[PDB]
Amino acid sequence: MYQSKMNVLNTEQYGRAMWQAYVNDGENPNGNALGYAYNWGYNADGNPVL
Amino acid sequence: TYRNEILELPETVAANGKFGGNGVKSVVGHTYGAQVGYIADGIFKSQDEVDNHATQEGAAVGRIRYRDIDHNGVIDERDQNWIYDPTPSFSYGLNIYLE
Amino acid sequence: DFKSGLRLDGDVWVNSIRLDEYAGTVDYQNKAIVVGVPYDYDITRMVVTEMNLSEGAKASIAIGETIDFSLPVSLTVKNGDVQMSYTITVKRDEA
Amino acid sequence: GEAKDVINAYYVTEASRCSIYKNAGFTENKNEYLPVPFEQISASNGNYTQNFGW
Amino acid sequence: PILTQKNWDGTATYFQSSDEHGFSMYYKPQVGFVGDPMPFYDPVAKDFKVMYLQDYRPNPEATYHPIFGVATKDGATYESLGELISCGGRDEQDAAIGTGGTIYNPADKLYYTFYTGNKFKPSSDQNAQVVMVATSPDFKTWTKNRTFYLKGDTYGYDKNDFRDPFLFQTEDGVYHMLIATRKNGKGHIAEFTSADLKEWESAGTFMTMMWDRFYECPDVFKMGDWWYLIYSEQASFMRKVQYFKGRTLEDLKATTANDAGIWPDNREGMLDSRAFYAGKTASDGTNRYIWGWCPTRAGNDNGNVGDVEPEWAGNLVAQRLIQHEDGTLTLGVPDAIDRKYTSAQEVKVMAKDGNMIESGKTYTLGEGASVIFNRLKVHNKISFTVKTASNTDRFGISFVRGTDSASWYSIHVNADEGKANFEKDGDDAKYLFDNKFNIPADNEYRVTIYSDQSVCVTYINDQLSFTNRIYQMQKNPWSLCCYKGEITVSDVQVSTY
Ligand SMILES: [Mg+2]
């Protein structure tokens, strides 16, 4: 049996990671052009939240 | 346990670093297959930390901070040192048989 | 153990729509819905009469609302956590 | 010889329409030639001289 | 790991600072840039819900102007509400969204916002700009009214020039919508009247323009006893915010009726330099605040102002309108911004090059004298008083001024020309732009600079307002220089937070 199964991102986790990368770079996450559409805003401190 | 070392080596072999050093430094006098790289001193967590650290290209908040080895104030290809040694401290085994 | 629970099944097809008393031809390759009118119809007030999409599929455009179709209108069909976009256009049977 | 000026003007102009040129910069007497490879310099010890500016 | 800290206080050498992706005081979202502001006072929450357009440096081809909103009740703290009005489809008329206005109807308890959809690559028979409306029940979710399409060509106005619907309700209770359109080749501010904000009647031409220019984002309001029209000039040569004054609405309309050019004051109604645009105002009932955007610079260079016109979008800047007894208007620092600065930084001298002398807290500078102070911080508030020998002196404040700095960026208050000039000193000797203002007759100046990272706003004795984009300014020394006259500086205070 295969025990050392590497944990890779699922679809939702992949979308969340790409959104995080886009907002950290300051680019528009909706410009990902991979079919993801993000509803996101900011918290009190101004940090982006998804 | 064991210790490995390379004592002499042809100049071109030391230069291209097929036996270690990544082509940056000669492996002579070091373990076979040892590698040379930068040193990661955590990550930046504030613009104050970015400014106080020695200048390096691409530094920003949340990026890896590389140590200034030679204290020249700038991070470049000379800020590298031996970081990898592919020789275990010791290897052990134990077999238990109960009847 | 690995599934994200994001319900990706989500059929989002559009069967047909009827603006007033006129049906619309649907092309899925470019996601377009073309409706023809007899070259004099008032294309500024049309009530979306019927629109059948799928089971569990919700559209941004509701049923019974009036719309100006002078220009193409974007429609989003959402099922679960997936969506599909269509462009609805109305043409006055120009010859 | 106008490589420095032309390249800097190009960087400034095209940084708007390409985001890769945000941090671009051309050095006056270093980047007009590729450096002699460090591997080759190490191999020929005391024979190869790196280009100016490196 | 051991962290090494450089001696910031004690070294005047020029340093390469960097700007954070988001600002706090002069708000700028961590993603994208703020474009034309849209101030609005919420009668329910009793705050300022200023909205704007989210610009991006690599804009998409067709559908590029999402609308975002931010609440700034004080004027200094900004909390973002996320995207409000999504840009339309590629083929829709609202692919790109222009500036607009907003009203709240208590009759149905609904917020109505009016914006300008810009058709992408419009055809000859297709209107390039169309006014649309979106409704919200709680200012959180918005639904665009698909049945409303106010075409410019319907009422004989320009198809391609129909922008900036400004909304306001008079005392009688009717609503007026103002469009900066073009009629038969002339700039016309046209008015549409309504009583329910669903049907509109064209009430002719509200006002005309001057010297075939174009007005951007017009805004009509009342301040005590005067009716003012604030507007932004589209002309590339000017590209600056001006205003008009009038005792009554009829007086304001009759102003420059046919190129009369009745300027509110001796400075042609100027309010700020090219670093301030799309100024639009709103009131909470006790103060009037105008919001604009300080532009960014191409290749983040202070000297690259940009010919013809500056760059678009930037940092959201809020200023407080000051109404004088003669009806003249000036810009002042908001009280919240002023009170935010609490910590006080000791000042000290780093350079002594001119014939200047130091006497306690008071310094005296002659011709060619310049004094360099210690480093600044990410947020700075520099306040001092300058007395000149006469009314024809040329002193100035220079930023990015290190001991080794080849070039520094200076603002010179030239009394002989009676203005201020933003120029690049050092080894460029380049003049960038200027701003005219009233020269005090007592040769006294109260200079106060409020700076957030790279955006600095200078106020001169409650009379001159001057916005600037100065990169590398934070964590760098600043200097005072004199060129022709004799000056005396005192009460130098630097505060940070
Ligand atoms: Mg180093």
Side-chain angles (χ1 to χ4, degrees), chain A, chain B, chain C residues 1-86 88-95, chain D residues 1-27 29-54, chain E residues 1-360 362-497:
Chain A
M1 299 156 267
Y2 174 64
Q3 57 158 351
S4 59
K5 176 182 177 60
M6 306 187 174
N7 296 330
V8 295
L9 304 175
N10 52 71
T11 299
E12 184 177 2
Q13 293 182 352
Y14 179 84
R16 171 170 292 273
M18 182 174 45
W19 168 89
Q20 181 67 208
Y22 265 100
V23 301
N24 288 197
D25 283 0
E27 309 173 5
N28 185 26
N30 296 329
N32 58 90
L34 289 185
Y36 280 89
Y38 298 102
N39 181 26
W40 64 282
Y42 298 88
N43 51 14
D45 300 331
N47 305 329
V49 298
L50 178 60
Chain B
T1 175
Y2 77 104
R3 283 319 299 200
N4 182 275
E5 188 178 354
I6 308 183
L7 305 185
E8 298 181 4
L9 201 69
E11 193 68 26
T12 59
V13 180
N16 65 7
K18 64 174 300 182
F19 297 143
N22 304 117
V24 181
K25 295 191 302 182
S26 178
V27 67
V28 174
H30 298 265
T31 316
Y32 174 86
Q35 294 191 3
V36 178
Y38 297 78
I39 302 180
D41 293 2
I43 58 179
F44 299 110
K45 289 182 174 57
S46 62
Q47 190 69 30
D48 299 330
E49 294 182 359
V50 180
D51 297 331
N52 293 330
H53 185 58
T55 182
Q56 67 181 34
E57 185 69 24
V61 185
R63 301 268 65 86
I64 297 184
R65 169 168 57 253
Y66 292 102
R67 188 179 304 176
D68 202 335
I69 298 183
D70 57 357
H71 305 72
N72 53 4
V74 54
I75 305 300
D76 49 356
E77 55 184 357
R78 298 192 303 267
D79 282 322
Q80 304 186 29
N81 199 20
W82 298 96
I83 62 164
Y84 175 71
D85 200 329
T87 289
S89 181
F90 55 93
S91 59
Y92 56 93
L94 180 58
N95 187 22
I96 300 178
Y97 182 62
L98 312 180
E99 279 186 348
Chain C
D1 185 73
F2 174 80
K3 292 330 201 203
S4 78
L6 194 66
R7 62 184 179 180
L8 277 298
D9 293 8
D11 191 0
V12 293
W13 285 128
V14 178
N15 305 326
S16 300
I17 64 169
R18 175 157 319 285
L19 295 175
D20 287 334
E21 297 60 60
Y22 302 76
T25 53
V26 189
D27 190 359
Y28 298 133
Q29 294 298 109
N30 48 321
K31 278 150 278 275
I33 311 164
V34 176
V35 186
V37 288
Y39 51 78
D40 51 61
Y41 201 95
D42 175 79
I43 63 171
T44 197
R45 309 311 279 212
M46 277 79 76
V47 172
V48 169
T49 60
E50 61 96 9
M51 171 165 48
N52 48 350
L53 317 162
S54 293
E55 60 286 7
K58 314 307 306 312
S60 66
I61 298 300
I63 288 284
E65 82 185 90
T66 182
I67 308 164
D68 188 348
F69 276 99
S70 165
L71 289 193
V73 173
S74 65
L75 171 61
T76 300
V77 190
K78 270 194 50 144
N79 207 331
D81 291 330
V82 303
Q83 70 181 359
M84 174 145 288
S85 291
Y86 302 87
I88 313 179
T89 178
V90 176
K91 71 153 51 63
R92 301 200 145 114
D93 291 332
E94 194 274 331
Chain D
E2 59 178 5
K4 170 193 179 301
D5 305 329
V6 173
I7 289 306
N8 282 12
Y10 158 74
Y11 284 167
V12 170
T13 309
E14 287 266 335
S16 60
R17 60 176 69 97
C18 293
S19 59
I20 66 169
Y21 296 138
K22 293 182 184 293
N23 303 328
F26 194 87
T27 301
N29 292 327
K30 189 223 301 179
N31 291 129
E32 48 254 45
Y33 285 100
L34 289 177
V36 182
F38 185 82
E39 174 182 340
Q40 312 297 333
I41 297 182
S42 301
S44 68
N45 46 1
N47 294 330
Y48 293 1
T49 71
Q50 192 58 266
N51 290 328
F52 189 83
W54 302 90
Chain E
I2 277 176
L3 297 176
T4 62
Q5 315 265 330
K6 292 193 287 186
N7 195 21
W8 290 119
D9 201 346
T11 62
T13 303
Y14 161 71
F15 171 70
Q16 289 290 143
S17 297
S18 295
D19 292 331
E20 282 293 339
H21 281 294
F23 294 171
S24 70
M25 162 195 308
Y26 299 141
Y27 174 77
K28 185 257 185 183
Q30 194 172 312
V31 180
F33 298 82
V34 55
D36 311 332
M38 311 212 187
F40 172 60
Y41 181 58
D42 197 7
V44 190
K46 311 316 280 303
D47 62 357
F48 292 100
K49 287 177 169 63
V50 63
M51 188 173 70
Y52 64 94
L53 319 166
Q54 192 96 330
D55 199 81
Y56 303 101
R57 305 290 93 159
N59 279 317
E61 73 300 344
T63 179
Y64 53 105
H65 281 105
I67 288 176
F68 280 63
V70 64
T72 179
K73 64 152 292 303
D74 62 329
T77 300
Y78 294 70
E79 68 182 1
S80 179
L81 295 174
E83 172 170 85
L84 320 182
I85 304 298
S86 177
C87 61
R90 275 190 37 96
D91 292 330
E92 286 201 24
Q93 181 82 39
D94 59 355
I97 305 180
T99 311
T102 302
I103 298 177
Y104 172 52
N105 287 337
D108 56 358
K109 302 152 210 72
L110 291 179
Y111 302 94
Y112 284 70
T113 185
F114 274 80
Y115 58 90
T116 309
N118 291 318
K119 180 67 173 66
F120 167 66
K121 74 181 311 193
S123 178
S124 66
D125 56 353
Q126 287 160 356
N127 288 317
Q129 292 161 348
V130 172
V131 167
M132 302 146 187
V133 60
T135 72
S136 191
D138 46 7
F139 211 74
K140 177 56 53 173
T141 179
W142 299 82
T143 63
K144 311 155 148 207
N145 198 312
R146 297 182 185 274
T147 51
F148 187 79
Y149 279 93
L150 191 151
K151 308 296 181 66
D153 74 309
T154 298
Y155 304 95
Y157 298 114
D158 209 22
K159 293 174 70 174
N160 310 317
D161 286 330
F162 207 93
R163 306 172 24 92
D164 306 318
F166 164 64
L167 268 59
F168 78 103
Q169 191 204 22
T170 55
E171 321 205 320
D172 59 356
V174 297
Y175 310 94
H176 308 269
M177 207 196 85
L178 275 299
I179 300 292
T181 175
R182 271 193 212 259
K183 178 152 50 183
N184 66 17
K186 178 93 211 183
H188 288 263
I189 307 298
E191 190 194 87
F192 295 81
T193 60
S194 185
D196 51 342
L197 294 155
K198 291 167 279 142
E199 294 294 328
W200 298 86
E201 309 76 51
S202 177
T205 291
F206 178 80
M207 187 175 177
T208 64
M209 268 181 237
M210 281 275 298
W211 309 137
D212 76 6
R213 299 164 195 220
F214 208 93
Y215 290 178
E216 298 295 329
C217 302
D219 174 16
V220 171
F221 51 90
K222 168 147 161 57
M223 291 265 268
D225 290 329
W226 296 77
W227 284 84
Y228 297 116
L229 166 60
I230 190 69
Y231 62 94
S232 309
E233 177 50 48
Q234 185 74 328
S236 66
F237 86 101
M238 158 68 67
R239 213 69 191 190
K240 286 183 281 184
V241 167
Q242 312 146 10
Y243 80 109
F244 275 122
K245 74 158 46 172
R247 274 314 313 288
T248 66
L249 186 64
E250 311 321 306
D251 193 1
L252 179 55
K253 292 159 89 155
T255 314
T256 184
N258 46 1
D259 291 331
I262 311 306
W263 307 112
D265 51 359
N266 53 277
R267 59 202 276 214
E268 269 205 353
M270 294 301 294
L271 260 185
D272 201 353
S273 182
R274 302 171 71 91
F276 192 84
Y277 208 70
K280 291 177 74 69
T281 80
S283 194
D284 64 334
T286 174
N287 286 318
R288 177 57 59 92
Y289 299 151
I290 180 168
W291 277 271
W293 51 274
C294 190
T296 47
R297 301 317 193 180
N300 67 12
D301 167 38
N302 299 330
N304 191 6
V305 176
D307 58 356
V308 183
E309 84 265 13
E311 288 59 50
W312 205 78
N315 292 116
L316 174 67
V317 181
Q319 316 207 45
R320 182 179 38 85
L321 276 177
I322 311 188
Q323 199 204 354
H324 289 301
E325 86 277 355
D326 45 4
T328 64
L329 278 166
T330 49
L331 304 180
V333 58
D335 58 356
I337 290 186
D338 200 348
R339 73 179 67 253
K340 183 173 283 295
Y341 287 95
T342 64
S343 161
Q345 298 299 291
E346 165 197 292
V347 295
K348 65 184 178 69
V349 179
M350 328 293 298
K352 304 287 284 188
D353 67 87
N355 49 78
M356 79 84 68
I357 62 170
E358 175 165 15
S359 65
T362 290
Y363 314 83
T364 298
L365 281 82
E367 292 196 272
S370 58
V371 57
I372 304 195
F373 290 89
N374 59 316
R375 291 187 186 275
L376 287 173
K377 277 175 183 45
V378 292
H379 317 267
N380 310 274
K381 180 199 147 162
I382 299 97
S383 65
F384 52 94
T385 293
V386 171
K387 186 180 289 293
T388 62
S390 60
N391 57 4
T392 174
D393 306 67
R394 303 160 160 286
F395 72 101
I397 301 97
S398 296
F399 308 93
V400 187
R401 187 56 176 279
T403 59
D404 45 5
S405 293
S407 312
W408 46 101
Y409 291 93
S410 304
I411 320 166
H412 321 264
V413 183
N414 297 323
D416 46 351
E417 288 95 9
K419 59 189 193 165
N421 295 73
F422 187 65
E423 312 171 49
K424 166 170 192 164
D425 291 23
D427 283 19
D428 206 339
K430 198 163 52 194
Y431 162 73
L432 306 174
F433 41 83
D434 60 354
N435 190 7
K436 294 153 54 46
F437 75 110
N438 287 21
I439 294 299
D442 55 339
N443 312 328
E444 192 74 290
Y445 301 93
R446 304 161 272 264
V447 189
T448 57
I449 298 103
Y450 300 79
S451 85
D452 185 12
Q453 298 187 49
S454 72
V455 193
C456 69
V457 183
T458 303
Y459 294 105
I460 297 315
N461 47 55
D462 197 74
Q463 280 297 340
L464 164 70
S465 56
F466 201 65
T467 302
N468 270 321
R469 166 91 58 169
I470 310 187
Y471 305 100
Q472 316 290 353
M473 150 182 85
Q474 71 275 17
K475 296 168 187 194
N476 274 268
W478 61 282
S479 70
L480 299 157
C481 182
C482 201
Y483 304 89
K484 183 174 72 68
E486 186 272 332
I487 61 170
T488 310
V489 301
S490 52
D491 214 329
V492 185
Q493 290 152 302
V494 162
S495 295
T496 61
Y497 79 93

